[model samples]
Target chain A: NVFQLIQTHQEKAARLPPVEEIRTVLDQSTHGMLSTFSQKHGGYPSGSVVDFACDADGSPIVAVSSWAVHAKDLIANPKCSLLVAKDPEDRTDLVITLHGDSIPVSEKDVTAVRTAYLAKHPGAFRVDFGDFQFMRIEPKAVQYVSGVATTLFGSGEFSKEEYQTAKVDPIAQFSKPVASHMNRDHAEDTRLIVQHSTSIPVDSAYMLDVDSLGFNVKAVYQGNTYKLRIPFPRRAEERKDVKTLVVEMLQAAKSQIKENLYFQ
Target chain B: NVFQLIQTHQEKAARLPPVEEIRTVLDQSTHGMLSTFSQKHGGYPSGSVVDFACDADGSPIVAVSSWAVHAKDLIANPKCSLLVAKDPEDRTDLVITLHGDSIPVSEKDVTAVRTAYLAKHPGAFRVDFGDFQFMRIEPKAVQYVSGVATTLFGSGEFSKEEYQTAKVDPIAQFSKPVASHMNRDHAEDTRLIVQHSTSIPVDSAYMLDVDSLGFNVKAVYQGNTYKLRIPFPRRAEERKDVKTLVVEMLQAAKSQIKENLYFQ
Candidate 1:
């Protein structure tokens, strides 16, 4: 049982389970590149940059104008894919492609979804324009991809059911503030935590991001950068909870460092 | 003649001709979201993030593995699109989607293109692996989109001939270093340049990017950010030319401000 636990942790490191991570990426992103079967090219995939918001069930909702090329393609055929990236400019960040049907939101449901969309894009003055309509993509399949330097890692496909059942991590909104505080005010604490948990004498460390499952850090050791995911001792549930969790981690790391120094 | 010239400058602002701008965008970017017709989903567009390099003629060159889903799609149907963004996380930056036919590089030309591809992606160790091959997308259509504060600007489509024949800007490689030097060392110059040229009295300014035609600056006016593109009096041919051009701008700006102060 101990061996199995070690193997699981080794394989996954500290990343969230696939489905929950997928939900988190989708939930956090405000826009994606929508690829639709091109009507003009007679089958080529035409891509458009679209601003989107996720419905409660994790479906990508977009407001597209009728005059738009991708909108025309979707009208003729709903089969498409939405590619959402955590940082589209960064090769190492998480990117997911959800493939399925994109259908127009029914008129009755427009008012409710519009509120959610506006919350993400507050100045979207054209949301209620006559030609502009809301559409939702119901993904049949999802593909997850993360790259490390030039090599691909943690890439796979998940079923629609898994994605639908997954919940957005509770600390999604709190991640940025919590990470900023730790990195800005507690830089030494972060370095100590990484050294204590991973047992690597990191020259320096900065918190890259945080979630309920764990936080990823960019650690420099021996003049090279490393991305390490350090998991929480337990799940973090709220904004206030993350503060305490990190504090506990810092104290434990300090005690371990003191103990090791005494032994040495 | 003066009125016409002023009107043209007013409408086009300081942006390059659409064709040149499109080429500049492609030349400056290394990767894009490739959308291909999914054989698995029976025609839905499957999107994958791909690293690419541009040929002298501005074709997007990619190395895809045989086992990759996109590789399979290209074999069956060469039709696809590459969506490249200047800064994918920033909604206000330039995004271009190139619709094209993706054909595998013929054996005869693989060696030449490999040298080019490797120049861009030097760390690609698997380039020569058995299952990997290089593919080039010959763009049939190009769509450009730039968003500012939830509003779309500089959006248009260009023809294949327009894209294929256009040359990459002479200072493409020099933009970043020049912009960085100016932003880091000459922040006040950038502010004065904006104030002198655009007459936008702003609290602060920073150089966003530089090109042969000119540079775009982010200026804060009345606590709101405005993107103003200021054109060079003459073309910049090389990295060394940018320093002189900026110095000339700073001198002109300083003179204008001094004149205003004397009048006051």
Candidate 2:
């Protein structure tokens, strides 16, 4: 209900913005505001601004001085929230929030994380003033909210196993039978998938690829072509398994609120 | 210790960034991610994105569907957090967080709030889909964090009276005499006032104005100049009363960490 209205002032792009674009902003960001559980303030949330850079996983790499209140609190109670920040020199639309366990960047992680951090923040190393140490928050949950309109919800929840298995544009000689079923049978599902992912005002949707993970949907909505991926209930053992998998989720949606009950 | 080092990456800004500039982003922003305390999700925070504008006191004005989960939760319990969110288009350095109570925008506010919301998002008005209604968050506390280096730390705690009484650059028959007392005579206090309000790296500090509500401080550091408003502990009666008011706070800073404790 509010979702469509939320899309009203969104980016003019006919297609949804990619999540990778958000990663780039995180990569480009040279710092994050570190909010920690303040022992001095009776464990109230305390915020300390600190310099940072993104590691290879785009996790924030920050060098916090041992004497800093944020670090002290982290040592006593590591619960913290990190915001990969842009310093509002002028308006640009980006910021990332990560909820995770604060752990030291190990010797094994030093090289890759250092290199990644230094790629955008060369001066960051100078802050390693003896007490200064690099720490990384291995995310327990993450939300890369690109705009108020579109967010790759739970993009942060992707486990290493899931991430490695999932690939964009992955099709190993993918099938037409499934696409035909979607196009021929369930047209509304295809359209809704595309519309929710972006503010395309998509006139229609088409079945493109069907995999064990999910099917692909596309459309020429407002003179711009857009594509969306729909995942299955679980990994399909084979091509024929996709039909069974999709049907199960459809039945699940039938019993729940259709708006958000369908595709994640 | 880390606070001084943190200012190293900050604005070579000869002066402090205006609080109004942050307000401008709040005003210019058409949407905010309204995160609420959810009862169904075991009382964890749940977010619903919505379009919004600010009322005169810079309160967020939003239109939420009664059917939305966020609205339903807000109705049950008024506690909520609103973000003057930026989607990180390229990068700008500001984000505001409000700890507040969600209240409906009265019918009397419809015309004024609607006009404000439409200024940046004219297409926003078309979403009056009957179930939609206007709302505002009356902030109990606020934090306007700009960078990993500087943040308007306690800007959210300003009482309604303080907010109305204080204005940025509130110039009256302001004189340099009281300014000089804070600068030349009490330079440490001057630097701390600016540094605490914003994480400014002040190589040198100066007095600019002394008004009914507060005094001003300027600093030149790293090829840039920055100025800050040092709000009084109470309503300054007149220009002549400025010294008595500032002396009171100077004594207070001696006991507390006034970089954050005083005049926030």
Candidate 3:
């Protein structure tokens, strides 16, 4: 029954993409908590609040004061975890805990990392201060917490190799211009994505953030706010290729609009 | 030295209260990540998202499904940590980690716990499906992380005794009559609490929740939204005594009102 289908929905084989989503969560975060196991006070995980920005290659970068307790702990014990997820307040939520080693961004590499940090948090331009230095958590493992239900699940080790290999732009095959065109040129196309193709229902839908990986639909359904991501057919590497792929997606979205009548 | 005041501002000893604010963080959460060491997977802290409600006594209560991964692990290994924290997306933040034991609530105690859960999430009344059971984390120790610099720092174990003893009311001394009078008739006074008495600034302030410990001020400032807390000189034990306490506070808030000269 449809009731059984909706009731038994599980984040299993088909849907879970831990590594890709981990980057989105990290990139979205303007700030995050750096948790360190403080040896000075026996090894309780101490959390420091820091302004953070994403690496161009999908890593995390932070500028920390030498006087900070978390900075001190990172020097002595490199093992720590950083929580970079949506607002703990999001209903359908994800909290990505990166268990990794804290390595200071070397003198040579500081500008690139600093540029990324300053780009997100321009107010932190004071990174020039003597005590401040950029540090990054080279995540050895990733814990993608669903914050609901159980662990018929498993943990996936975050590969730094894969992290670097993955596309920095969520949807590279399609340009931002294409995304802007979709939301602006065709509003019906997006309404179909939310009402027809995705789980969200709304009177209206618009783009919040769209990338080559997928597109985000922001809508208010039944007075409740919702944001859903709809994936592309495949990763598009070139902007020229996005045109055909997008035409196919629009046709598919149109087909789903009609299919809903039969499902109902 | 003034530079040191703001510069060396670090989360060190003094002015940290893990318990009172911990309850507020837990109380505000609709759901949180439960990190447990999985015996099945060699004791790496496995996380599951779960629906949660604040206990009547400011403790946390949860209903877990038998099929869930976190529920299964808790039965074998009682040790776990639940993250009750604010999103670093705030001006002032609190993240409370209860390092404790998870034990199932007795069948006799289930009804009371169930009532509490249903109050927060009215749609969750279907928890009677035999798969659901109530469990409580008995926090043996606490690790409260402040993402800000220190004050006069203090740390102690979270006491259920204190949770039970403190008034369920946040601003205990003040009556709704007084609060309403202040919020409506004395809107300026309410504004002063957010602008004057607290670390937060706001466009306007109104009361959201009140308890004996403190009251929550709802305000939006500088195009940014805020929820600031203003604690009383002392936890008012009797409501009548609050009358005088509040009148005195009104004059004091008035004094702090003009001191804005130093701040701006």
Candidate 4:
């Protein structure tokens, strides 16, 4: 019971603060499920798969095609929401929903919006189509769910101003590649890192997300999965910093385990 | 241009029919993005990650907590949509949106509903919580998007009766594991299979999905990705049948490649 409490506290302390977490999740993914009030089907809310990019203020902008049904929904009603998750495949991990007004991008601002959206979605040729236009979601309210563990840490809701003020993490650009490499090439090292940090016997570990402050790992032990975060000894400002920090942690862990075994 | 057209036709022919595809997508994943009419925030449609199980009639049923905001929305309006995709992480693959009325599972029918829901989600201990109740979406209109490929093959919309009558694919239960094993252990074999079948020089390949009819491979050559499919010689009714068929296909491909190289 005491060990469980300590482990919970460690996880709580290691997470990216809510605002940073929101910014990171939003910055990482280009596409999400966009929810809109239905125009064709009366009374029912409608959902569509939409590609989106976050503006400087971390607000989501969508390229809506006039031929698309969801575009018709947004045209009839600009009231909508954009749902993004930390893991595109598993929404249960961490999810954010922006409840806001879909304001049409002014003709004067269209160039900048197009540039930003295209930067994230390089293959978005549909943007060149005359029927497509940009619409920005001006979030009135935002909800950041840390799944079922919401009770242990941060609040779920954020104000529009809070979201607008949050800084996008630098690691957002390269974190996925780094995590994939760790999972693919350094599986043993990841398992060792988790076993050392958590003092739990882990059969395997996969890097979920890594930020400046720390990284989250999904560790499996005895068929049970534990989501634990290992904080970097120091803040990592860039991609190389994360690489160095992870290697250093692994080396230290290896040395400590060697010492313990020799003593035994 | 003609070769491109034929390849597109082959991919279309290999895929499971639209209704089977929809049912398979629904059956494979336990969770999706749920869009609901927001009660607290007026006008804006709200979204949250929701876990759902398909009922006997192939409709989605969700367990909503009264304490949750979306639950309140459903309780007040009963109008909502659930979006599911063939690939959980990438919505661009094949997406479906069910525009429906969220009808609460009656007290008398809760037992069967609970059995089916829990069968999919064993760790859903929250079901026992008094505040949570099952709400089945009675779909009014359904949109089955095959991403941008909707123009080539089938219609995107499905009638309610059509969806209800659709049979879930037999391979749905074990397809993910089968695909994962192939991707992880037999990656070279998968690449060989793709190259042999498509005659495209693939650097690597990953199994996106597999059904009784065929399996989809995402092949990359010189950084350009192509979605291709390989059909089974015969429809596989069981998990072992799929295994046998895949092995046979790989062996045939390997032998053919050996023969072609010898001739050269």
Candidate 5:
């Protein structure tokens, strides 16, 4: 049934949030955390809200308090799992399951990851203890289950490229439809709003709304959209292709609606 | 150039080896190839080949010798990298870089993974020691670099439906092409040959023949195809499509050969 659901919603379901969006979710996440081990409770430990950060690859990196229970668990059982979920407003909620073995940070890696961690969570530097060690969980297998579809991650015999290009990318393809939806139905042309934003990369932004009067678009970052005013680009005429594609999509959707009304 | 290569070779690259073919690679592989750690034995901690087994997700399940340097290094720094290369004869020649944290096996998982490991490698039982611990690498990031193209594993923020489609059945789009190639190519007909010989499930397979006759095919496992001789379950009339396609490909090759001869 789940597989069938995936097949049914294949078009809408194929649109993946950019990689940066997933990273942002991991960066902002605070609750529902688990650690490999607690050193304080003799190493073998259970659930504790350990402060953690994700690497560029989304591996959870935690600064372990030497006296923590989970630290002991790491000593006995280095392999661990962590789950992080995205905020509700994004419409599409994301939960990441990270699996890897815990290894203490190298002295060389300490300064860089520490600086990054502190930048994310300023309180980490205040804690005093020589035994406090930074642990990096090297993920080996990841099972990303969303809605009714599940993806098992690892490399052996399965050709992932074949999987991504043929199965994933085609399904995830969504550009003109989104642009059109924002242009015609919404009050402001959301598509142009994002296209004109200055704070984020223009290429990364999508047009949400556009009309004869004015336009409104959302600037996307880390899975969240920030409503922004549309600014006319200097070379607006050069972007005729963008304008044409969005207009065509809106026209297509409108015609479909008209056809349905006629049928009724 | 890399993009061009992907564009050209993408159809071939997406083919998945049958599950049994993958199982054969797994069966032949000895646990613990080379692992790198930060601990300084001389310069950096020398990477040593460790005996490892693959979990269902393909993370290396290493039965770490208690006294091994890398084992101690793992305790000190759980962050590590692993490289798994495909069998040399297999033209897909895939190599994956797995980056993740390690988790110590729970008493429960240890029994199951250990049994699986020992079943694959009967010699594993003899090396079992009380001091030896079982650790599983949970992947945080799996970088699959096929040819020159790379894809990050589990790093996208997708809707539940998108995630499911991307992860669960990523080979759906390419299935048609994979089947087409196998059905058409005669000299490279080993796609069906291997599938009919081994207890492997042939979801899809891609053949690339340098010599045209003796070459390589990458088959993905979906179900067992070992017993089927022709593999294609079509009527003779329906099978004409494959015959026509094959004749066209051979004719094109012959034209190219004639052009070369004329130049000489």
Candidate 6:
């Protein structure tokens, strides 16, 4: 069954390549295509060669200017689909489908995402920031295509057990009797740290949390949580400077961030 | 731009075919492949020659035995992907990729879905009841493939705009302010009555709030929604025996309901 195949992929995803290797693939890739409906034309509208950014975790975030027609379409229909594939010039078979609800980044968050994006895409630093709006595609599902030859990864088939395991294991971890007790009863002054991190083959989580501001925290990804430092802003006054701190920490840890705006 | 295309599709979908036409395509179709990852096998698996039933809105509902590998896989991976195409005999280029999160049918809902299915597939009724657990694929995304020669409806290109519109328009109706208000405010007392009483085109939806069911249901076909009916269940449940009533309703609407499930 396909579900099982997806589960296997999820497992494989948890332990596939080093974050650097994946980042390299993403950085070298070009072209971010977003498909939408044009109310004026009454036909399909395609935006190719759009700018994108890949988080340390391999998640692709797209930056669309407010003036872009597709941006308006996204506002009209928050449900959007994105196709990110290796540039045809690269001739790589890697293609990932990201389908989800589009979430608008607050002007505050946009500055951070933009700064992170500019750190990699220095060329875009000179571009007027005011024209851009970061539209994050919080993926509900992902379809990765690696071509027909990649049978080891189960390209043409679907597995049920694997899919169920992926879905269930996370829930089990999140709601585990012991884990819940630790999280709810034991922990105090808990705060969540959301970072753009990617999974690496060496570790299920390649993106590390080096800044632990309070009591030990569990960072949840997909469905599973790992005990790690909970990054936080220094104070209300420092919220504007959190992005710089995160970047510095990322650099100190030598985490490989993809240079491209969109990921393959 | 793809966004422009999507806008185009929204318009097309708004003018979709009536319910009867869509039902015909859905009825004539047989032989769908279910893909999922299998944990027991440690790989992806596929199931073929499965039976399915379509809701008035053209969504597929399938039944699998609890012990079936696919069922187990689904338990692991709630996200299920299915491929339905014209029967091999017809050699038509019509193929649709149905992607959605599926849930195991509760015992109560199972009986209703089963009865609806059995009424159409009387010969498999026993098999369905004895071994199968119902699963509904509420489509989040769909890809319909057709050859270029077919043009219009059978075009070879996978129009991303159409896909977006297909997902968006229905959601708009489902989540409309009034619809949301009705669903949230009157959910407990609501008695949704969806019927395929008329053999009109599958795209037509007619809304009539007979007794405050408050449903904004629409019939969809080929990624388009048309002729929506609100606050009414198509099947009348004057009789307490929903199972028998459904069977009777289906029989009575045979003239309108006897279309082939898929186009060859």
lDDT by residue for model 4 over A162-191, one digit each (tens)?
Answer: 988888888767777989999999989988
TM-score evaluated only on chain B, model 2? 0.51
Query: What's the interface RMS deviation of candidate 6?
Result: 13.4
Model 2 misplaced regions, further than 4 Å = A1-58, A64-99, A106-116, A127-133, A142-161, A164-264, B1-51, B65-98, B106-112, B129-133, B142-157, B167-264
User: Model 4: per-residue lDDT, tens digit, B39-156?
Assistant: 5577788877788898988778888877665645776678888887766554446777888888889999888898898888887766463557788988877787664334455347
Worst 10 residues of 1 chain B by lDDT: B1-10
RMSD of 3: 8.2
Note each model's CA RMSD in angstroms.
5.1, 18.1, 8.2, 3.7, 23.3, 24.8
Q: lDDT by residue for model 2 over B1-264, one digit each (tens)?
A: 333553533433322233544444455566655556544543223444456676767677767766654346566556666665333331223556565676877788678777876765667546463467767777665556444213544233444344323333322335545665566677887666555445565776687655455555557778665544456666666565777776676666555574555668
Interface RMSD of 2: 6.5
State the lDDT of candidate 5 residue by residue for A8-119, as single tens digits: 3332322223332233444444433343433342222133335677654555677776554333454445656554543222212344444467788788988887876775
Go through the candidates in order and give each one's C-alpha lDDT: 0.77, 0.54, 0.59, 0.77, 0.44, 0.41
Model 6 residue B45 CA deviation (Å) reads 4.8
DockQ of 3: 0.12
lDDT of 6 by residue, A84-164 (tens): 543221112444444455677777777778776775556775757766667765544444444321325523222222221
Tens digits of lDDT, candidate 3, A10-73? 3321232556656655766676556565545432334555677767765677666666644466
lDDT tens readout by residue for model 5, B1-264: 122322433333322233322333333345422344442432122233356776655557777765553345555566665444443222124444445567888887877888867855576567444567777766544433233122322111222122212221222223345455665755344443443333243655455321111223455554321111122222222334444544444465456557979999
lDDT of 6 by residue, B1-264 (tens): 122333333333322232222233344343354545344532222232346776544556777655543334555555555555432222223445555556766778777777777655667764336656677766554544432112255422223233333321221222234434434563322222233432223433333112122233434445654333232223433323333443444454453445544332
At residue A173, give the lDDT of candidate 1: 63
Q: Across all candidates, what is each one's fraction of true contacts kept?
A: 0.83, 0.00, 0.00, 0.88, 0.00, 0.00
For candidate 1, give the docking quality class from DockQ: medium
Indicate the worst ten consecutive residues by lDDT in candidate 6 chain A: A166-175
TM-scores of the models, in the order given: 0.86, 0.44, 0.62, 0.86, 0.29, 0.27
